[PDB]
Design a protein around this ligand. Sequence first.
Ligand SMILES: CCCCCCCCCCCCCCCCCC(=O)OC[C@H](COP(=O)(O)OCCN)OC(=O)CCCCCCCCCCCCCCCCC
Ligand SMILES: Nc1ncnc2c1ncn2[C@@H]1O[C@H](COP(=O)(O)O)[C@@H](O)[C@H]1O
Lengths: 98, 48, 60, 55, 347, 175, 320, 120, 110, 49
Amino acid sequence: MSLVYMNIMMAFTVSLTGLLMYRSHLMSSLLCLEGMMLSLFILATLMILNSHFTLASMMPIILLVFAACEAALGLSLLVMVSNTYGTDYVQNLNLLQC
Amino acid sequence: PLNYLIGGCAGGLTLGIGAAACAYMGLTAALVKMGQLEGWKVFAEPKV
Amino acid sequence: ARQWQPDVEWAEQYGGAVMYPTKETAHWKPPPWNDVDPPSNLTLNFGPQGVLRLVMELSG
Amino acid sequence: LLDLIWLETILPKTISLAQMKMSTTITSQKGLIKLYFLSFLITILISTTLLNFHE
Amino acid sequence: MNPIILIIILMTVMLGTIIVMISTHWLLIWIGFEMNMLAIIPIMMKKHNPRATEASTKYFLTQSTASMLLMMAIIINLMFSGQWTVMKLFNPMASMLMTMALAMKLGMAPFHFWVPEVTQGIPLSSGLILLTWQKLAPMSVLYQILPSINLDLILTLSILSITIGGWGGLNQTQLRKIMAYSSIAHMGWMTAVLLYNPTMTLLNLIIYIIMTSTMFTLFMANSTTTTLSLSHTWNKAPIMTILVLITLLSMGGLPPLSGFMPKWMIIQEMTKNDSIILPTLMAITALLNLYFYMRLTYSTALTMFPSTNNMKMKWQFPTTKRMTLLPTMTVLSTMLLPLTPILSILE
Amino acid sequence: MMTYIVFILSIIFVMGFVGFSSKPSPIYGGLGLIVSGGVGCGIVLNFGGSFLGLMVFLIYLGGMMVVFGYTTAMATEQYPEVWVSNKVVLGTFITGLLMEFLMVYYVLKDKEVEIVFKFNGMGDWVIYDTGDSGFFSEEAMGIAALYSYGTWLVIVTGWSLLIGVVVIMEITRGN
Amino acid sequence: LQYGPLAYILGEKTTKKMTENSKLITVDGNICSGKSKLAKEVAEKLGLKHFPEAGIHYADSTTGDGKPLPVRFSGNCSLEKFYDDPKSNDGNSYRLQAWLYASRLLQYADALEHLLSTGQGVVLERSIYSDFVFLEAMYRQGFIRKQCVDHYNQVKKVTVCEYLPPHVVIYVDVPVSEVQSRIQKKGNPHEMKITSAYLQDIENVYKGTFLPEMSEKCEVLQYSAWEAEDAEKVVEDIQYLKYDKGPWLDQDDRKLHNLRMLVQDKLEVLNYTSIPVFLPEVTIGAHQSDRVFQEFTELPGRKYRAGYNEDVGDKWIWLK
Amino acid sequence: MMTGRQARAPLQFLPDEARSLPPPKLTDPRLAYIGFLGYCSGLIDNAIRRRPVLSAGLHRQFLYITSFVFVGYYLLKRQDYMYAVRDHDMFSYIKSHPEDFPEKDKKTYREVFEEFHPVR
Amino acid sequence: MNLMITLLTNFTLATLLVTIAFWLPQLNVYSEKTSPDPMGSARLPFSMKFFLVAITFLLFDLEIALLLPLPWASQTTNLNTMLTMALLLIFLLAVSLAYEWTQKGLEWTE
Amino acid sequence: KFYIQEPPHGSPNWLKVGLTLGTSAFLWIYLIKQHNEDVLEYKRRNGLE
Ligand SMILES: CCCCCCCCCCCCCCCCCC(=O)OC[C@H](COP(=O)(O)OCCN)OC(=O)CCCCCCCCCCCCCCCCC
Ligand SMILES: Nc1ncnc2c1ncn2[C@@H]1O[C@H](COP(=O)(O)O)[C@@H](O)[C@H]1O
């Protein structure tokens, strides 16, 4: 397919691979997840402006707002983890092995 | 079918446990041979 | 003689964290019964930076 | 010999031995979220490139 | 939790699933999944202990990844089709992404690695919601996009889900993880028959929700979370003893019980379409589910009985718990098989 | 050179995610995501999406990544780094960022022009100014139609934001 | 139930009945400290509902006809046999102690349920917070084993964390000499077999372990053998306290609604007392449990739910 | 399968054309079996709350039976409607494509040759 | 184009003033000094209140993001629907504020 | 009396019993009316009179 869309998809898959190989922190997971959301915003915006499809121009803002609210929820979860262990480490989140 | 039964038991002797893997891989390769003969579909297309 | 109802050794081998204790599963202790797990405040030194030093046990 | 051992070995017990070994190689997960998403990416890199399920 | 806030949040969960069910637009599908997740996160944290925060964190990560993959599938559909109707997808790349994302939202294998954890971390009513109500929206989207779902991918996910939900039930004493692996196996069963007859998908879904709701209602009536804690039911409430176990004999898939109703019908739709090997293998794995769950049945109705002395005090107090629809759901999860041709109402 | 500018930004955008998908730290991860948000906003603004680019700055970057840096700065206990006199404390920064722009200019090489020149977009890609629109940004009026046409969308969005407030205040209580 | 979440919606808020007299006061002391009169005296000065000390047959007194049941249905343990042989073979020591912990847990649940359903305070005698002080004093005498202390700490860890501490802990200082004087003057032939060092270890775990950890979570009031005789000085100490510690201060209608829904469900209160931790003093086999349960079902009024027994004169059953 | 039929008139539990079909009788064995399920739910409800199972709550058992019969009557009407739609669409598609459904020439066994396999 | 030149000139002047501010007193050979505040070696305790006001900013900022196209939405033909949805969004922002009020969310930073 | 505490089901809840019998009788009479209207509609559409 097209070229700049392939670049935005490449960024989406790169932040996906960063979202699928955890190093140390939960904040790194939330950052890779919101980089994915950013690339979804960029690619949706370029499609909607390309076709001159007018009513969908409110769609990326919608795609922003919900997902930003989603990120807020994720941040609050991280905080409660960091109120139990002192760190946001993903290896402290292993009590559900049994 | 019998030749791939021999081939499955040959793959089972280099697997180990020995006779069980012999019989299992022999019966599995037998089912592969019989699927190639009678046209048995594992991921069958939805037709009706 | 009447009808076999267990020994306690039969009941204890259906417990723990795992059914079959293997090598990697032997140290897994079972979770707590009510599913809750057993889990300070800030202390500042307003130094001389009249003059007075203030040790503050603050709580937020 | 034949019933109390051999036919007791092949039908009820070596098959159950196979299932308990397969489950202890499955149900031995450490609970690490890193390894769980690493296995998810193993799935993605097997299916999207090799297995060709997007075609 | 404030009960008015609980009612508002539960109606928001129901509203998010309804918005996924009624919408002709992909943005509203995504909005309904976001609303459903956002509202179900406090249901898991009803008790405020670290296992619920860990469970909610794992659930947030998996469902958020699935939501972003769903939006990427929607965006690629808008590339190759320029439109937004919830219908078949116009790229097999977007089809593969939406199938993977809905398998993540259902917890189908190999994206099953969050289902026995989160169900372990949360209470029994929230696990009931997670294993009954949260299946309804991605199965609805799979119902609406089946002209684009790849056959080989959905069959691979189906049989892998049935095998892993089978071999997950061996090593477990926790009732909630056993319900989670039973969930994974039954989602493999539902998505096995999806591209052949989705009426049997809805039949399997309804029978699964009835059996799962009966089992979680019995677990809430007895307040038992493990096998060993379930083993004291015979001395406390003896009528509670067998109903769990005839419901679990149903959940294995066993005649004449109504849990034999889905799987047989699924086989009845796959031997029509000339697949003989695949339902044979899947229902042999269902017999492996019978193997482990029948071992649990032997655990409760038989050998490992013995009581403790404080149980004598529980004899002087009845259950004041709300066992809501539990006789109705116990009758509907066993004796429904002579009404098997009722399934035509699900067309 | 100037024609391919959106494409150039997209390349930088991809490289920006390699800044933080390799995850050196959550703080440098936030920094790389801010730079990536700015260059993806440049991509958006160069198709005439002015309001959407300012929503990237005002709501994604200045609204949400502020909160990500704020929550990150309330975690991940810090430690000092190299603090020698100016031949280290700023000279290494300038040589490192010059090597970063060297890496940006370094990828535009013979393996790139086989994709650029065979699939030349600039010349025929950016077609947002195809004819006249009138006295109005079409993107502005499409966002304006959220209130007349988007009644159900605004209802479910405002309900999700109210439920977001309620959900955050319930899970962040501990009681 | 009668009280539920719908009653909380319709306006039955349990801080509306929380007055300054709504205080849960636990009187603590040694075996014959003579506090049993004092608590009753507080019940006729502060206007509080006195709950007596939970014996073997507390749950028998709360349910059914209110009479004590035979010992095979309730307890399967005797206080007097612990007085005779504390180092017995069959393990009456930890079995009697665990049944007393469950009975005091039902007493404390009834105490909080009365306090939250009426707004009238409750005077308790030796609540669940002061029960381990016997157990430890038993384990210091070798009367039980270490595994019994582990089982009790498991049950306490999963049960006492759900509740609030009392408002006032009234402790009585009576040394071992006057305790033995009152035991020998009491006239119980079994109770006089209590050794000296057992009472000493009760008083030691009182003074060194119980009261210092109760000092942070509530306010204690400590009395000797003779100044606890006057009720008016005790009531003047109670009323002129300034309640400033403890988790009672951050209790709104939501937390107290959760606590009141918790304590009215008696099977959820008594849930974790019978955890499946197999200890030989409390483990009953299947045949004995079956036989005792089937003998329990044929007791008058115990065959069905309480409004449904024709043998004790329940009418209108076919419309209930 | 038949979702294109219920797509021009959505969310109709019983369409108007379903009124052209005979309703189930009130002595339907399926409906009496659903009433038996109501009686079983009443007995289980009186059992799990430790009530005298046959005696207590006769109004409650009567409402269990009545509610199951009431829902089951409409479920049987919808079942009969859906199988009637199935046969109606089948017969219309058979009538509208005779070239895909030829009349097979039925041969008597005096022409049909079967290989005899002797059993001995 | 002019905007990119202006941003580049502002960035160049900023980096030039920072570079002058660092390299001009490092001409001096003043002194290499040694021996390295209200805490000496204390860790940072987390505060829940600062995170609550950050998430409150983010949620009301999303509600403002919805409210932003109102000067354009005033020009529409369906003014009754537009007025109802504008008042509904500002009312939901006010309901979020009242729920932040009554559940003690605005306390000790009120 | 026999009980030391009053049970929640010592007396029949007459509002609940009355609503139960009234709702059940309403479902019976509405079911009979629906079946009579359906057989009348069947005989009117298919001419079996
Ligand atoms: C084509 C078909 C389309 C779809 C058809 C319909 C699908 C319905 C799916 C239903 C899923 C229900 C999930 C559970 C209900 C949701 C709310 C909830 O959890 O209520 C339970 C409630 C919570 O009370 P709480 O105080 O939290 O208890 C925990 C201990 N304190 O109270 C309790 O915990 C009390 C214990 C009993 C709860 C029983 C709830 C059963 C609900 C499901 C009934 C069966 C399914 C519906 C009928 C068949 C249709 C599939
Ligand atoms: N370990 C114990 N030994 C003896 N009595 C105990 C023990 N724990 C609690 N008690 C109770 O304490 C009572 C003594 O208090 P009193 O009623 O004042 O004599 C006894 O009658 C028992 O019911």
